Every structure is written in C-alpha cells, then in structure tokens.
Amino acid sequence: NGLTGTGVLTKSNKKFLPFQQFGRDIVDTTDAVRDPQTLEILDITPCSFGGVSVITPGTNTSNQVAVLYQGVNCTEVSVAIHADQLTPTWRVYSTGSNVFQTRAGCLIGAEYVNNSYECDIPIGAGVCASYQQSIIAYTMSLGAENSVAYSNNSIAIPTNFTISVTTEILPVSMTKTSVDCT
C-alpha cells in the first residue's frame, strides 16, 4: 500500500492495535507491516548481507583460495548459490567436504581438521587456517600442556644458566610534512 522496500516476509507474533498500519524499531526502521488484503502482521527482515574474506596461502605457493562469507548461515548461502542470487557472481567450488560452518561465517574451500596447531591465518572465534596439499581450518591450540609437580616439600633449583640476547624495536619519530593549502 505504498510502503516499498526489500526484505523477507514472515508471520509475526506482534499484536497490532486495530488502527495501525506498520511498525518501527528503536532506530526508526520498519519491522512489520499489515497486509491490506489479509489484515495480518508480517515481520520484515532484511535480505542477508555481509563481508567476504579470501584466505590465501600466497600466490608464491598456490592459487587456491578459501572464501569466508562473514555472518551467514551455510544453509542460506547454499540456497542462494543454487538459485543464483548472490551478489559476488564468482562461485567457489563446493565439494560438500569443503564447506564448514564457523562461528564467524560460512567457510568454503577449506577442509576442517580435528587437530590443533599454532595459528597461521586467523579467521575468527578460535578458528584458524593454514596450507598443508590443501587449505585446512582448525581450532587454534593455545600451547603445550604442562603440569608442574607441586608438592608439600619439593623445590626445583636450577643448576646452570643461559645468557640470552633479545631485540626490541620501537618507533620514535614520524616524517615531517608541510602543506600549502592554496
């Protein structure tokens, strides 16, 4: 009825008063609408969007890439890919075994492994990726587990030592510039 836009319509549990036409959010965005021919309240959700990140081992090593659709359920990327309605026309090959649902998005092109290594390429939410060939996605390992042998009357004292030299690099000054506005 003149209220135009794009979104996904669904049945809403909101109870409109019988004189209202639509709804608004706390940020003055439309959240519902009443059908002029059915008098039912239809929730409106925006069509899915997000970022796209490409994981690269480096062109010096391989031309394989893995694509991360940030903030998207894999069930809706696969639906839109089949129906051909995803803005980025290029499509990563999906062999079923290379599609993984991370907490950051849908990761395509990387085979998830149950092992854990030090993080090479940080993806997010504890998941990293590396090249090992193919691209593997794993949950990063924080370090080697250790258990000190604590006891009531046991102490460990070093019998030797090591002189180590470490280097620290600190920026001190920028580059001075002067600009003539005119």
Partner: peptide, 29 residues
C-alpha cells in the same frame, strides 16, 4: 642484566641481555 641501544631509521633497537636459568633439579626442602 644490561641493554645496548642501536639506532634505526625512524626508530631505535634495544638488545636486551638477560639471565635465563636452566637444568633444574628436584630437591626436598
């Protein structure tokens, strides 16, 4: 123990000399 400064373009580098223990042995105390 000691550190040595080395200049660098638009910065400074420190060589921190430190003492690290090694070869721990178990004892009763």
């Amino acid at each position: 123990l000691m550190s040595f400064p080395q200049s660098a373009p638009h910065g400074v580098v420190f060589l921190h000399v430190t003492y690290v223990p090694a070869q721990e042995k178990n004892f009763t105390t």
